[PDB]
Amino acid sequence: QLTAAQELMIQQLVAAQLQVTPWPLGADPQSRDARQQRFAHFTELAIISVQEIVDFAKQVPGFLQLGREDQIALLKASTIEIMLLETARRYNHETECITFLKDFTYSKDDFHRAGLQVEFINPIFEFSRAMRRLGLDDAEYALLIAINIFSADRPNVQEPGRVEALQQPYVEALLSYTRIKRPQDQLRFPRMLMKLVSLRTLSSVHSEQVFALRLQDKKLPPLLSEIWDVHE
Ligand SMILES: O=S(=O)(c1ccccc1)N(CC(F)(F)F)c1ccc(C(O)(C(F)(F)F)C(F)(F)F)cc1
């Protein structure tokens, strides 16, 4: 059985989880004006998502007690990975579109028309399509977010000991949870850790997509730029 502490920590995350430039209509796929506007649109959706991630992290117990520089370091690293997880969760399997809201849904072709390369687009969609087999519930997703946030090995983490100590109870709860819910499925926890490694890969692919965009004279807005731009 889940302990009182584990029930509590999960409830807290599950509760915490609870709480734009228009697409250019009918513009040529090749239009440089329109590719820029399609890009700007994604950019603004991304900014909404990061604010959500910040506001979530702030509610996770212990996060706000970390030094200010660790808070930023953890958030800089996990932002895109949490975004990708959330993208997977909302992904429409019938229509093959990542779903931001209700009528805000995007296919591989929509991303390609925004200037993105199939090298980035194909993986994000395969990751989303693949997550369904896992069949994660709300408690499992939230646990995964929290464990992603408290990764002691991110660039520029100054108190990784503290960070790992915060992560541990969440890893323990997730293991217990999958064991209780799917006792016959011994590969389930490994499957979850596998998604955590794919998220690292995808995060790197995203970073290169960002750089590639800069080479096409496409610049992120200041908020995203501070998270994702390379600079020497
Ligand atoms: O799901 S996203 O976060 C997303 C962003 C905006 C609108 C819908 C969906 N996303 C795809 C991913 F699968 F990676 F999560 C995504 C994130 C970031 C980007 C970009 O960083 C930017 F600039 F658009 F925000 C970039 F296009 F550069 F890659 C693009 C798509």
Curated annotation (Swiss-Prot):
The identity of this protein, by name, is: Oxysterols receptor LXR-beta
Region entry Transactivation AF-2, spans:
2-232
**What GO biological process terms does the UniProt entry carry, in alphabetical order?**
cell differentiation; cholesterol homeostasis; hormone-mediated signaling pathway; intracellular receptor signaling pathway; mRNA transcription by RNA polymerase II; negative regulation of cholesterol storage; negative regulation of cold-induced thermogenesis; negative regulation of DNA-templated transcription
Q: Which UniProt keywords apply?
A: Activator, DNA-binding, Isopeptide bond, Metal-binding, Nucleus, Receptor, Transcription, Transcription regulation, Ubl conjugation, Zinc, Zinc-finger
Q: Could you tell me in which tissues this protein is expressed?
A: Ubiquitous.
How the protein assembles, per its UniProt entry? Forms a heterodimer with RXR. Interacts with CCAR2 (via N-terminus) in a ligand-independent manner. Interacts (when sumoylated) with GPS2; interaction with GPS2 onto hepatic acute phase protein promoters prevents N-Cor corepressor complex dissociation. Interacts with ABCA12 and ABCA1; this interaction is required for ABCA1 localization to the cell surface and is necessary for its normal activity and stability.
Q: How is it modified after translation?
A: Sumoylated by SUMO2 at Lys-181 and Lys-219 during the hepatic acute phase response, leading to promote interaction with GPS2 and prevent N-Cor corepressor complex dissociation.
Q: Which GO terms describe its cellular component?
A: chromatin; cytoplasm; cytosol; nucleoplasm; nucleus; RNA polymerase II transcription regulator complex
What role does this protein play? Nuclear receptor that exhibits a ligand-dependent transcriptional activation activity. Binds preferentially to double-stranded oligonucleotide direct repeats having the consensus half-site sequence 5'-AGGTCA-3' and 4-nt spacing (DR-4). Regulates cholesterol uptake through MYLIP-dependent ubiquitination of LDLR, VLDLR and LRP8; DLDLR and LRP8. Interplays functionally with RORA for the regulation of genes involved in liver metabolism. Induces LPCAT3-dependent phospholipid remodeling in endoplasmic reticulum (ER) membranes of hepatocytes, driving SREBF1 processing and lipogenesis.
Q: Which family does it belong to?
A: Belongs to the nuclear hormone receptor family. NR1 subfamily.
Q: What is the effect of changing K219R?
A: Impaired ability to act as an anti-inflammatory role during the hepatic acute phase response
From which residue to which, out of the full length, is covered?
A: 218 to 460 of 460
- Where's the Glycyl lysine isopeptide (Lys-Gly) (interchain with G-Cter in SUMO2) crosslink? K181, K219
Intracellular or extracellular location(s): Nucleus
Q: GO terms for molecular function, please? A: apolipoprotein A-I receptor binding; ATPase binding; chromatin DNA binding; DNA binding; DNA-binding transcription activator activity, RNA polymerase II-specific; DNA-binding transcription factor activity, RNA polymerase II-specific; nuclear receptor activity; nuclear retinoid X receptor binding
- Give the NR LBD domain ranges: 5-232
